[PDB]
Structure 1
Amino acid sequence: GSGLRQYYLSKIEELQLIVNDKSQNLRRLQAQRNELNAKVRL
């Protein structure tokens, strides 16, 4: 576990953290596109 699982379990941490991170970054960019698309359509 400390030699054969911990190499993966500590590594999937930061792979979870960046997906956790940029989802906040994505939905910021999502709503900004919806502002301009509702502005151009109108």
Structure 2
Amino acid sequence: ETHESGIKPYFEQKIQETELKIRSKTENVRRLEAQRNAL
């Protein structure tokens, strides 16, 4: 388990950036959806 914890953060770095993007993405699409609806 100890061996895997060392290399885990190397797997993680590319994936977490992808995650952080998703958070911004989700808020964006919905907000334009509201503008789109009202119009």
What TM-score results when the alignment is normalised by the length of structure 2? 0.68
Alignment-derived partner of residue 9 in structure 2: 6
Moved over 3 A (4+): none
Q: Hey, which of these two has a bigger chunk of helix by percent?
A: 2
Give RMSD over aligned pairs. Answer: 1.3
Residue 6 of structure 1: how far off its partner (Å): 2.5
Unaligned runs of 5+ residues in structure 1 are 37-42
How many equivalent residue pairs? Answer: 35
Unaligned runs of 5+ residues in structure 2 are none
Question: For the residues of structure 2 that align with 1:32 and 1:8, how far apart are their CA atoms?
Answer: 38
- % same residue: 43
Structure number with greater Rg is: 1
